[PDB]
Structure formats: C-alpha cells, structure tokens
From Swiss-Prot:
Changing W150R: In NPHP12; with extra-renal features; functionally null mutation in vitro. This is Tetratricopeptide repeat protein 21B. TPR repeats lie at residues 108-141, 145-178. Belongs to the TTC21 family. The lineage of its organism: Eukaryota, Metazoa, Chordata, Craniata, Vertebrata. It is found in: Cytoplasm, Cytoskeleton, Cilium axoneme. Component of the IFT complex A (IFT-A), a complex required for retrograde ciliary transport and entry into cilia of G protein-coupled receptors (GPCRs). Essential for retrograde trafficking of IFT-1, IFT-B and GPCRs. Negatively modulates the SHH signal transduction. It is linked to Ciliary dysfunction leads to a broad spectrum of disorders, collectively termed ciliopathies. Overlapping clinical features include retinal degeneration, renal cystic disease, skeletal abnormalities, fibrosis of various organ, and a complex range of anatomical and functional defects of the central and peripheral nervous system. The ciliopathy range of diseases includes Meckel-Gruber syndrome, Bardet-Biedl syndrome, Joubert syndrome, nephronophtisis, Senior-Loken syndrome, and Jeune asphyxiating thoracic dystrophy among others. TTC21B is causally associated with diverse ciliopathies. Component of the IFT complex A (IFT-A) complex. IFT-A complex is divided into a core subcomplex composed of IFT122:IFT140:WDR19 which is associated with TULP3 and a peripheral subcomplex composed of IFT43:WDR35:TTC21B. Interacts directy with WDR35 and TTC21B. Interacts with TTC25.
Amino acid sequence: MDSQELKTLINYYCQERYFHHVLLVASEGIKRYGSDPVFRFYHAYGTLMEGKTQEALREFEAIKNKQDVSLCSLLALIYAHKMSPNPDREAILESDARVKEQRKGAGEKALYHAGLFLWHIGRHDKAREYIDRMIKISDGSKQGHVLKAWLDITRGKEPYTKKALKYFEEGLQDGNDTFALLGKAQCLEMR
C-alpha cells in the first residue's frame, strides 16, 4: 500500500471502531514511513481507544508541536482528557485555546488532518470550517475540494450531490485518487 492508502485505511478502521487493527496498520506505517508524525498520531489514538490512555497522552505530547499534526493531536488530547475518569477541564480548555490560536495561522496539511479527525467523530459541520479554511489558504487544493465533496455527501442533502460530483470530476482530471473515485462512485449510488 502507498502511505495515503494506509492513512485512509486507518481512517476507516477508526470509523468501524477496530482499535487493534488501527495499531497493526499504524505500526506498519511507523516501519515504512517512521519520519512521518501521522502514523505516530494514529498509534496514540489506537492506545487511547484500547484504554492505555496514559500512553496515548504521552504519545501525543511527544508530537503535538509538529506543524502538520498539531491541530489533530490537540483535538485528540481533548478527546483523551474527555475519555479519562477524571476529565481535566483546564487541560481541555487550554487545548481548545491552542486549537483556536493555531487555526488562525495553520498550514494546508494541518487543516486537512483537523477536518479528517473531526470526520472520525462524525462532526461534519465543524470539519467543513477547517476544510473551507484549507481551500481558501491553498487557492483551491484538489484534496480540499475532494474532502469538501465528501462532507457534501455525508450531510445527505440532494442538491449538494451535483456540486460534489463536479468537484470529484475536477479533482480526478489531474490524476486518479482512491478517495476521489469512491466519492464519484457514491454520488452515482446516491443518484
């Protein structure tokens, strides 16, 4: 598998709550691509959901400063604190303050992973804010338009399917993408 296919496989095993399979694929990503923080972020999410939340907190603390992963790891720190038996509201609010501060200046990759992490939780209306910002910063990134077209599928409303299908076609003209092709296929299924 290519790195994007490992990442999108983990995003789906996360949607299906397969927490140990996430650790298997994340550990393969750490062996194949060990300089990339995103597989370490998924490994920390897997240890959180197994219930090794102290390990997950330290695994996020090891990577939270890294620019491509800081937003999604701060969102996962909020979730880890909320899963804990004694939720630290001050650490949650301090993490929300870091998210709101970084959201002003964040790069394209950081906003893409923030939208994808909110999409794990089904927070599609919040994910749209980060992906709209990603598109406006990037002057129309095709990865941004493909995920906006997927958020236009996940909200279910019919007229957005025509817009979504055009955004998948316009993403595909530059080259094939598995998630963009699946978005086109799902528009055809919805019609």
